RNA sequence: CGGACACGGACAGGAUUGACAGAUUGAUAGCUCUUUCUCGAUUCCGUGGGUGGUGGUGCAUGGCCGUUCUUAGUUGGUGGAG
């Protein structure tokens, strides 16, 4: 439960993420891929059928979350503000991190990973 | 586009750059078409707005110069006409 809340959120700042209408399906073909995340409300589940054919066969590693209406202010464009509107952006279904570069609380994500999925 | 910014939408389930091969070209300008690969929020689209101008106006101006002016001319400060 700590893995869901705060320790994924310690390293998502400036790294090689996924952002844009060709990029998320572009940058997954790379062997720098550390821990990633998937929004589990994709309307056609055939896009995520492709990434599940991509993720488990090598060491790519997911966390399931709800959507992108709430991750829409997590990826890098925040629309709610003291002046921003409640609807400017929609986030992504699938972003990655290709190099951490910092070890702030980067253990509870990596401890969770070889904990339950062996 | 070398149209900064302000606002609204379109933007990760598909905005925007680049580009070989073939008509397309005056031309190795993907200019544009044909099929498709590619860059990664940078932007595009409309709406207000700066901008650039060897664009007009020397009869709106400045500065500079030229001339009447290449000759000896010019002017105040406190002094006559019951």
The full DSSP string for A71-110 is GGGTSS----SSSS-S-S----SEE--S-----SSTHHHH
DSSP-derived pairing of the beta strands A64-65 and A94-95: unpaired
CA A91 to chain centre: 10
User: Which residue is listed with tokens 């992504």?
Assistant: A92
Nucleotide in closest CA–C1' contact with A19: B12
Task: Provide the b/e sequence for A10-43 (b: ≥16 CB within 10 Å).
Answer: bbbeebebbeeeeebbebbeeeebbbbbbbeebe
The separation between CA A23 and the C-alpha centre of its own chain, rounded to angstroms, equals: 13
A 31-50, residues with C-beta < 7 Å of strand B:
39, 41-44, 47
> Which nucleotide's C1' atom has the smallest distance to the CA of A72?
B12
Q: Mark the nucleotides of strand B covered by protein, meaning any atom under 7 Å from a CB.
A: 7-16, 38-42
Across-strand partners of A65?
Answer: A39
Obtained via which technique? cryo-EM
Residue count (chain A) = 118
Q: What is the nearest nucleotide to A84, using C1' and CA?
A: B7
Contact status, residue A96 vs residue A34, Cβ threshold 8 Å: yes
Give me the half-sphere count of Cα atoms (radius 13 Å) on the Cβ side of residue A34. 16
């Amino acid at each position: 439960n700590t893995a869901l809340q705060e320790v994924l959120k310690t390293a998502l700042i400036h790294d090689g993420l996924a952002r844009g209408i060709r990029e998320a399906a572009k940058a997954l073909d790379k062997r720098q891929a550390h821990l990633c995340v998937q929004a589990s409300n994709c309307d056609e589940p055939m896009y995520v059928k492709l990434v599940e054919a991509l993720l488990a066969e090598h060491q790519i590693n997911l966390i399931k979350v709800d959507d992108n209406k709430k991750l829409g202010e997590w990826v890098g464009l925040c629309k709610i503000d003291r002046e921003g509107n409640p609807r400017k952006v929609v986030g992504c279904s699938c972003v990655v991190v290709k190099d951490y570069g910092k070890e702030s609380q980067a253990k509870d994500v990596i401890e969770e990973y070889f904990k339950c999925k062996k």
